[PDB]
């Protein structure tokens, strides 16, 4: 209450406090050593105890956000390292805190972390855990200015458990290596989405983000009324808005109270929160937002009755027609949690789309009377396209899946460059194994959470080096017509092949000692040549040829000689291939 340190220090705990401060420090002073790091930590935590001891001592009346700018402009080399940012130290709070997070910088130049060998790591752990750890958590989280703290915090620990299980392993690379990939991918889809979702706020605007709340949020809280889930969205429409703008401290009270009033309220939102309102202070918040769909009540009217049927639908609406339009999406969506919140949107839109026609027509009800028919066609793109796809994976592996999608989409833009068409394929191939294992009725909002992030990555590369305009369509279209605007490609009949070139078919014997994982990429991106090549190859003709380089490399590295092999085997396929495709 009188000292902000000593409480937050109470809260939280020695452990998680130095953690979170080290990660704090980390992101804006991204150019500083780990020791100086270390140092400052370890001198807040000590100015921290102190506090506690007695709230009355010196200074610990002071605010988080000025302990903090004072010890920030406590570095020397301030002004000599990070220049700019030491004018910084010369304006008064809260300027000097605006003014601190203007010169973070979203993308700095540092090298790419590598990943030591399972060995030295794992000695490295064993012979200095805290070092170890914290270490990487200040590599990491210098690397992400942007990622919200608490949440680098649960990474970690996932890591330390992983370090933990594996490095007493009989095996530890068989046991550690996949874990460490699996959580790298976690790491960069959570720092996606949230890069994401601030984009999304920024172009799109507050009503947008709104409809997405209100409808997400109604699948999951199927049972509360429409009031509390408005006052939610509203609630978390300021929570984003805020930690957007990239105040830690500000974000986190923020996220704190919202969790707090949801567990207070639980049993009038959802039956669901037991669990995560009984975890600690630093992981509600998180859980919370994980929380499984609660059911959704068994005797639940038809949505006809309100929306198609009644005879105030024009009068409800002009009346407010916001609230109206939140009201549908509100008992649309917690009636269909196995619509993508996408599809949930574009049925909304579609519906104000008619009203706005219908109310201002002869006779109302007549006018509008059919929509529902207009929902059919909608609803049922995006659940043929998961079966057809889905089929298609379980037939084919999620390799050979992959190198299907590879030429699928080489032959709608095949001026992309082909590294980036092999990773888009390649990701485009995971979503299909993560998701269609999950039963029909979930696999339509999974798609759509890993969907999401692959078209934003791919949006932003292409962003940068702009190839297709119309890629440039999709990625600049609307919210709700990303997806089915790539969808709507078809294969690009203007194109005009690349030339022939020898070196790009040729393969040596060392593709044999290649890792299973830079072998396929190896093969994927031939194939995305080969079809670059010859674009106008029918399915039967590539299959052919790819069988053909199947068999050529099995039998070139179980024979004497390889390099020979290669060479000899080589100019044949390439020969025939090229006859066989004219
Ligand atoms: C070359 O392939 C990659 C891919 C993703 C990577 C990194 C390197 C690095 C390392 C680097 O920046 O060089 C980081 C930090 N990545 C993340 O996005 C991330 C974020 C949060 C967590 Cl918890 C874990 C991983
Ligand atoms: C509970 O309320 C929300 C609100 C926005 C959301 C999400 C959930 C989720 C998570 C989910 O889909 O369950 C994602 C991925 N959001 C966005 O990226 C986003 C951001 C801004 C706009 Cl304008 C539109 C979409
Ligand atoms: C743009 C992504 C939104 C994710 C998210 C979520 O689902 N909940 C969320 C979950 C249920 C009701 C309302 C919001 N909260 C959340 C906010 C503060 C504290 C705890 C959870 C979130 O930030
Ligand atoms: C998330 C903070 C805890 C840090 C633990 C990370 C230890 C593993 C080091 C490898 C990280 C580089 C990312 C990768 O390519 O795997
Ligand atoms: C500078 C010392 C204070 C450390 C700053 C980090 C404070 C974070 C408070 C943790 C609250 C969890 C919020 C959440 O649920 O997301
Ligand atoms: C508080 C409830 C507000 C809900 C407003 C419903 C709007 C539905 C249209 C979907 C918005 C996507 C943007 C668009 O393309 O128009
Ligand atoms: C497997 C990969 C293909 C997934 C099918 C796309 C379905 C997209 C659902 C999201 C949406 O409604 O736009
Ligand atoms: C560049 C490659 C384009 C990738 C398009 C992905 C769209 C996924 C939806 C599936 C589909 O309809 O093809
Ligand atoms: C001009 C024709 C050159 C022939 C080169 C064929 C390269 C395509 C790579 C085929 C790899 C398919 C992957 C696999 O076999 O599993």
């Known amino acids: 209450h009188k000292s902000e340190v000593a409480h937050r220090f109470k809260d939280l705990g020695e452990e998680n406090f130095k953690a979170l401060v080290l990660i704090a420090f980390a992101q804006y002073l991204q ?12 001198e807040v935590t000590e100015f921290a105890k102190t506090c506690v001891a007695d709230e009355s001592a010196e200074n610990c009346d002071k605010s988080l ?7 920030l402009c406590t570095v020397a080399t301030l002004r000599e390292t990070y ?19 203007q010169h973070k910088d979203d993308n ?29 958590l200040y590599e990491i989280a210098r690397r992400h200015p942007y990622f919200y703290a608490p949440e680098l915090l649960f990474f ?23 874990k460490l990939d699996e959580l790298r991918d976690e790491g960069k889809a959570s720092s996606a989405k949230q890069r994401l979702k601030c984009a999304s706020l920024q172009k799109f605007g507050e009503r947008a983000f709104k409809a997405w709340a209100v409808a997400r949020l109604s699948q999951r809280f199927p049972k509360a009324e429409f009031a509390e889930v408005s006052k939610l969205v509203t609630d978390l429409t300021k929570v984003h808005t805020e930690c957007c703008h ?39 918040s998180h859980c919370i937002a994980e929380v499984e769909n609660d059911e959704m009540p068994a005797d639940l009217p038809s949505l006809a009755a309100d929306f198609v049927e009644s005879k105030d639908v024009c009068k409800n609406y002009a009346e407010a027609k916001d ?28 519906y104000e789309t008619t009203l706005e026609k219908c109310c201002a027509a002869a006779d109302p009800h007549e006018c509008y009377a059919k929509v529902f028919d207009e929902f059919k066609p909608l609803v049922e793109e995006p659940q043929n396209l998961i079966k057809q796809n889905c089929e298609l994976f379980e037939q084919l592996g999620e390799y050979k899946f992959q190198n299907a999608l590879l030429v699928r989409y080489t032959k709608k833009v095949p001026q992309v460059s082909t590294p980036t068409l092999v990773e888009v394929s390649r990701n485009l191939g995971k979503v299909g194994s993560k998701c269609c294992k999950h039963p029909e009725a979930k696999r339509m909002p999974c798609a759509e959470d890993y969907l999401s992030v692959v078209l934003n990555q791919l949006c932003v590369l292409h ?81 052919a040829v790819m069988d053909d380089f199947a068999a050529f490399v099995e039998k070139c590295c179980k024979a004497d000689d390889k390099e020979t092999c290669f060479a000899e085997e080589g100019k044949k396929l390439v020969a025939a291939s090229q006859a066989a495709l004219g």
Request: proline share 5%; aromatic share 8%; net charge negative.
């Open 323 to 350: 609230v109206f339009l939140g009201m549908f999406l509100y008992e649309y969506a917690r009636r269909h949690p196995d619509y993508s919140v996408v599809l949930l949107l574009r049925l909304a839109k579609t």
């Open 463 to 543: 962003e940068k080096t702009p190839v297709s305009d119309r890629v440039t369509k999709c990625c600049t279209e609307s919210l709700v017509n990303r997806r089915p605007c790539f969808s709507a490609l078809e294969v690009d009949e203007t194109y005009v092949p690349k030339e022939f070139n020898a070196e790009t078919f040729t393969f040596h014997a060392d593709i044999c000692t290649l890792s299973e994982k830079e072998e396929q990429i190896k093969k994927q991106t031939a194939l995305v040549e080969l079809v670059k090549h010859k674009p106008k190859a029918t399915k039967e003709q590539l299959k």
């Open 156 to 178: 970690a620990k996932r890591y330390k458990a992983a370090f933990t299980e594996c490095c007493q392993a009989a095996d530890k690379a068989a046991c550690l290596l996949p």
């Open 31 to 42: 150019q500083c050593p780990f020791e100086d790091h270390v140092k400052l930590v370890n």
């Open 83 to 101: 220049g700019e940012m030491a004018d910084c130290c010369a304006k008064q709070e809260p300027e000097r805190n605006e003014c601190f997070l």
């Open 246 to 284: 990239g105040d830690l401290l500000e974000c986190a009270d923020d996220r704190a109270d919202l969790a707090k009033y949801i567990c207070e309220n639980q049993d009038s939102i959802s039956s669901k929160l037991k669990e995560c309102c009984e975890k600690p202070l630093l992981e509600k």
């Open 65 to 71: 956000h000025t302990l903090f700018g004072d010890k």
């Open 108 to 136: 700095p130049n540092l090298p790419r972390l590598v990943r030591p060998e399972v060995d030295v790591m794992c000695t490295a752990f064993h012979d200095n855990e805290e070092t170890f750890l914290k270490k990487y």
